Amino acid sequence: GSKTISESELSASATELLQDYMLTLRTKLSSQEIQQFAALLHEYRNGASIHEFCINLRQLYGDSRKFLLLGLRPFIPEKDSQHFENFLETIGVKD
Amino acid sequence: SKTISESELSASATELLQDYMLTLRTKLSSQEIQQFAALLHEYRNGASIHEFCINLRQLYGDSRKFLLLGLRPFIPEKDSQHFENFLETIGVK
């Protein structure tokens, strides 16, 4: 929640992954869309539920770009990871 | 503060946040660290640098003002001048 800085916010390795993920997004998303992503990640880290985060990601990315959601795994803390895997399986995205 | 700033993208800044959180343990209670965590999250989500500074000063209090200096690597360049102005105003510079 908002009162807890999560593992990925404190991990240099996860941060390297975040920076590269953002560069990767440029290939499929517009600048305005990447702004929405940033807003969504910020909302999640600020306490939005994992469900709310996932639903908003899915509607932003759309069916044709949902594969990009796999790359968010490192930013999901332990408590929310099973929910996130469930989400990925539900929308037909898998490694 | 909508964009993910250079500070949030920087592996070294993240390492320093971990280091700073370990520092906080020696000076703040768990509840106070919860307050810090919420403030950083609100700043990152959209709170102004001025709002962040004002709330941190209130949280830390006079005797822990020196800790604010450790926030430097988490403040993106765009907010740096304001942050430094704040530090000088409260006399920690």
PDB file of N, CA and C in Angstrom, chain B residues 44 70 75 92:
ATOM      1  N   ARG B  44       5.800  11.170  -5.762  1.00  0.00           N
ATOM      2  CA  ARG B  44       5.928  10.478  -7.024  1.00  0.00           C
ATOM      3  C   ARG B  44       4.625  10.448  -7.822  1.00  0.00           C
ATOM      4  N   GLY B  70      19.639  13.680   2.895  1.00  0.00           N
ATOM      5  CA  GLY B  70      19.732  12.380   2.250  1.00  0.00           C
ATOM      6  C   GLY B  70      18.706  12.136   1.150  1.00  0.00           C
ATOM      7  N   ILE B  75      15.277  13.349  -5.786  1.00  0.00           N
ATOM      8  CA  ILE B  75      14.635  14.530  -6.323  1.00  0.00           C
ATOM      9  C   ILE B  75      15.151  14.722  -7.739  1.00  0.00           C
ATOM     10  N   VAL B  92      19.442  23.963   6.943  1.00  0.00           N
ATOM     11  CA  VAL B  92      20.242  22.743   6.999  1.00  0.00           C
ATOM     12  C   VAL B  92      21.404  22.818   6.011  1.00  0.00           C
TER      13      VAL B  92
END
